[PDB]
Amino acid sequence: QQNKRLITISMLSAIAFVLTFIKFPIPFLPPYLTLDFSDVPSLLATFTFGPVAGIIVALVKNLLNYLFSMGDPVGPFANFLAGASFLLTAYAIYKNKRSTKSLITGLIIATIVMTIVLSILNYFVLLPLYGMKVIIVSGIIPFNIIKGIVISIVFILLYRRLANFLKR
Amino acid sequence: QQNKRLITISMLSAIAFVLTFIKFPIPFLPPYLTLDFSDVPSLLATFTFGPVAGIIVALVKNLLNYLFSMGDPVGPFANFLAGASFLLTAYAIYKNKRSTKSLITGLIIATIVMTIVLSILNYFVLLPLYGMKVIIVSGIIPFNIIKGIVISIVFILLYRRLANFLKR
Ligand SMILES: Cc1cc2nc3c(=O)[nH]c(=O)nc-3n(C[C@H](O)[C@H](O)[C@H](O)CO)c2cc1C
Ligand SMILES: Cc1cc2nc3c(=O)[nH]c(=O)nc-3n(C[C@H](O)[C@H](O)[C@H](O)CO)c2cc1C
Numbered sequence: 043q044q045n046k047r048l049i050t051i052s053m054l055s056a057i058a059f060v061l062t063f064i065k066f067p068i069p070f071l072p073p074y075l076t077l078d079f080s081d082v083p084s085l086l087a088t089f090t091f092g093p094v095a096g097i098i099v100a101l102v103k104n105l106l107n108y109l110f111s112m113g114d115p116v117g118p119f120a121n122f123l124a125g126a127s128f129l130l131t132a133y134a135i136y137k138n139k140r141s142t143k144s145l146i147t148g149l150i151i152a153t154i155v156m157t158i159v160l161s162i163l164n165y166f167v168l169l170p171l172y173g174m175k176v177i178i179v180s181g182i183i184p185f186n187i188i189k190g191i192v193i194s195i196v197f198i199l200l201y202r203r204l205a206n207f208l209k210r
Numbered sequence: 211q212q213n214k215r216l217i218t219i220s221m222l223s224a225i226a227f228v229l230t231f232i233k234f235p236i237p238f239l240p241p242y243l244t245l246d247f248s249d250v251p252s253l254l255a256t257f258t259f260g261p262v263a264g265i266i267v268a269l270v271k272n273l274l275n276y277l278f279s280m281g282d283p284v285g286p287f288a289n290f291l292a293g294a295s296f297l298l299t300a301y302a303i304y305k306n307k308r309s310t311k312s313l314i315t316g317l318i319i320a321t322i323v324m325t326i327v328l329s330i331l332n333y334f335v336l337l338p339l340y341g342m343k344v345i346i347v348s349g350i351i352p353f354n355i356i357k358g359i360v361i362s363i364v365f366i367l368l369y370r371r372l373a374n375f376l377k378r
Contacts, residue, residue, distance in 0.1 A: 045266070048216045052223040052270045059224040098213070102220045 047091055051098055054083040058103035068185055072178065074117060074171055075185045081125050085197045093133040100125035116171045123163060128156035128190065153190020160186055215259055219266055222251040226271035236353055242285060242339055243353045249293050253365045261301040268293035284339045291331060296324035296358065321358020328354055
């Protein structure tokens with residue numbers, strides 16, 4: 043039971059960690075911003091268990107990616123922050139009344155939050171990925187948008203294909 | 211707490227799943243027997259939490275490997291059985307009185323069990339990896355032995371290098 047939740051959380055983290063390495067920077071946009079579906083399983087986790095289940099996934103994926111894809115000891119962090127802010131608000135919307143109309147709108151406000159909060163913390167995190175400008179933040183945002191959207195599209199498709207033997 | 215256990219179990223499963231693909235059949239021995247350290251983290255899991263924590267890891271690693279490295283819908287199973295039999299007895303030895311002397315001997319009896327039980331179930335599982343002879347079982351055993359040993363050596367080294375800031 044508790045163990046059933048734990049087992050699946052683990053599987054989702056495994057797949058996420060994997061997809062962590064299938065990253066591919068965006069044309070015309072900065073390359074420290076890479077983009078992967080290490081976040082889609084984070085979302086299946088959250089719309090199956092808690093948002094806490096979700097956060098566990100975004101978090102474990104990022105830690106592992108840290109040790110290994112090291113040399114970028116911040117990138118991991120930004121990827122977590124986006125993951126969690128977005129998954130949190132998106133759940134903090136699909137949470138309330140009803141479902142599907144709510145899920146999708148939860149994803150739209152989700153990417154909007156994510157982009158805001160991250161363009162903010164990016165004006166106090168782009169600096170430490172010097173350790174390891176405004177025009178830079180307007181290479182940032184365009185990115186965040188597409189991540190929001192695309193993760194949403196992919197998530198949505200798969201979450202759909204759960205109807206299969208979720209029932210039928 | 212419960213969540214701390216769950217987090218680390220997840221990390222260990224992620225690393226295991228990964229190491230699942232770094233496999234490399236043994237010279238002079240059959241090639242459906244591949245050999246990987248997808249089992250070492252299973253062991254760190256068990257000598258840190260339950261043997262149940264251990265089994266969760268050997269199990270999640272094998273499931274994922276199933277879906278993906280499919281085409282071998284039995285290999286996954288045999289890898290689980292070895293993993294669990296060995297990790298189980300090895301813990302069912304380091305469990306009792308004292309530690310280190312017990313840990314190592316737990317690994318010795320562990321590989322001896324694993325080899326026995328698997329050469330057994332292999333005389334009623336080599337057949338279904340036709341679906342998907344005695345001389346074959348004496349390409350099997352020599353394998354099982356080296357897996358026991360080598361996993362043990364590797365496990366032992368790493369488990370050691372936990373002294374670092376496990377304390378100092
Ligand atoms: C400086 C820096 C900024 C990042 N900003 C974002 C971001 O704003 N949104 C996002 O989804 N991922 C972001 N990432 C994550 C990036 O896609 C991923 O962590 C890669 O591992 C970086 O190589 C950022 C990474 C770095 C290093
Ligand atoms: C027919 C068959 C027998 C196997 N026997 C063993 C075994 O005896 N011991 C072991 O540790 N792994 C065994 N494996 C696991 C193998 O190393 C791994 O799971 C690969 O996925 C097989 O291609 C076996 C796999 C197959 C297909």
